[PDB]
Symmetry: D2
Subunit: 155 residues, 4 copies
């Protein structure tokens, strides 16, 4: 038995949905995560070509929670500009979380504007909802949204 | 397939903690001397997987088992702490007092700045003793809600019981 | 199943070596400038698995790709060197001179005390250059029989050819 | 195509073959290798209970060749006091060796004496026989023989 929790973050961007989606769907993005997010990772291992099926093993500096987890690039839908990335090992999965999924959806607003709609769904054992509730936030998705938009806006 | 690894390279805030102590006591029908000799045995560390079967996914022992020894403990998937290092700080034969400090990983990544286990084996009679196992930790006050349910006397109690079982199953010196 | 890891803890002899130098030169129909910009590109390290597909089982890059960067290279089973670390010592733009030192593993476990690669890109004309890649190593004389057949200009020659291919397949700045 | 090479070492011991074999066949021996051979290993990982099927991953200090290899406890014959241990990864297998096997055979001489007969067979590609010939010796087996006999003789 698990409780389902869904959290959301949105970010408006003065660029086309296609220009933002190009970055998010780029297979070369994985190897550029330390450039995009300086000092976020102590260690990042990329297993694969950066496309769907790629696993990322992320290790953070001492003091931070998650210390380490693995993420898998599970699904890309270019038409809908939608990307799914599952946490498959470590991190919150060691604190009663049985399922953890990030979804990013770049939605066009105008011709040269869009909204980055990021969300994370997780399933928790009730014995742990009070423990992990405060730990799980939209931080990682927000950081990505901010960095990608800044990369695209400044050209 | 291809594996690529990319490794980059508050002075009052760090001591802005509250101190918590949790105590465990196991009184057992064996001598302090018999219980202490297991605890103070330098060979104990390498026998932890035997003493506590299915506790560890991986155990690394750095050093000779005496004071200064570091134990790197990795636990099976799903379990919290997944990994941490502990260091043998004190093995005091006269007082039957052992100190073990968590030095990296585990609760130290969840707002805890200091974590020390103390085991004191105290006679209560000629063939009985108390194993007093305690954990003193310092936490940033705003992680007390998070971390208190996780920090229990579980591993210290597990050790006390397993060692007691060994001894009460009367083997010898 | 159970994993247990146990980790314990001549001043003239160490410099009693002979010096060997092996030279490789690739003269190519591209400018020194074009060839150098690839070699001196800080992003080159993270693209080595792309530049040299199937060369590495694992590659770790420690640092930003500039001077000071350490590369930990693990090769597929059966291949010698299985693993070693190299360090970017010099990236000299004025002379088109790059130095890369093997600092741990590989030949350093087979009697070699020092191993330095130097790459110098020299103009031979307006649209041509020589890539002079050399390896200077110091070995204990009694491992020369062992290690000389193993140490070749292979990896330096592989790099020179791969970079040349990239450039000669005329892409841009 | 490979060349076959077999090298041998013998050690006479003033103890019974059974008293020596007891040590060699002891499943607890693996975890006591650093005690038996101080300073031989930088790191020793034991994967298994110490019995047949156990894998040992041995890492040596910088400067030494092999830096690292895995060994597997393949066969025990108690009647004949015979033990087989194969090198399965790393070490000489990265220098044209396609097969590497250690055999230890404790043979009784008298009632309270025996000979420890240790040998290693390997198969090499001819392109590498001159390279690995000087590297492969009975050292590891000799070290084991010396340490076990000393343990048993001194009681
Ligand atoms: N494509 C994965 C991007 C990602 C995942 C987790 C993070 O914590 C982070 O900063 C970035
Ligand atoms: N039972 C394996 C014993 C062993 C194997 C290789 C060695 O190098 C060594 O010193 C000891
Ligand atoms: O690749 C998009 C992404 C960003 C942050 C995450 O946490 C997961 C995926
Ligand atoms: O008895 C000491 C001890 C060692 C390791 C632990 O994890 C706990 C206690
Ligand atoms: O061009 C620099 C260089 C980097 C890594 C190597 O292995 C060899 C050369
Ligand atoms: O266990 C016996 C043994 C000793 C030395 C080896 O190299 C291999 C096995
Ligand atoms: Cl790229
Ligand atoms: Cl973690
Ligand atoms: Cl942990
Ligand atoms: Cl007390
Ligand atoms: Cl007393
Ligand atoms: Cl190597
Ligand atoms: Cl020159
Ligand atoms: Cl010039
Ligand atoms: Cl044992
Ligand atoms: Cl090796």
């Amino acid at each position: 038995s698990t409780v389902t929790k869904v959290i959301h973050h949105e970010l408006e961007v003065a660029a086309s949905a296609d220009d933002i989606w190009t970055v998010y769907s780029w297979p070369g993005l994985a190897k550029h995560l330390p450039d995009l997010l300086p000092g976020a990772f102590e260690k990042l291992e990329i297993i694969g070509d950066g496309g769907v099926g790629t696993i990322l093993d992320m290790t953070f500096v001492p003091g931070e929670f998650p210390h380490e987890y693995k993420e898998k690039f599970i699904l890309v839908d270019n038409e809908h500009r939608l990307k799914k990335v599952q946490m498959i090992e470590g991190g919150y999965l060691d604190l009663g979380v049985t399922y953890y999924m990030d979804t990013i959806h770049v939605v066009p607003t105008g011709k040269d504007s869009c909204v980055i709609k990021s969300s994370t769904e997780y399933h928790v054992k009730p014995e742990f909802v009070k423990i992990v509730e405060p730990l799980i936030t939209t931080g990682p998705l927000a950081a990505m949204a901010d960095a990608i938009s800044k990369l695209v806006l400044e050209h």
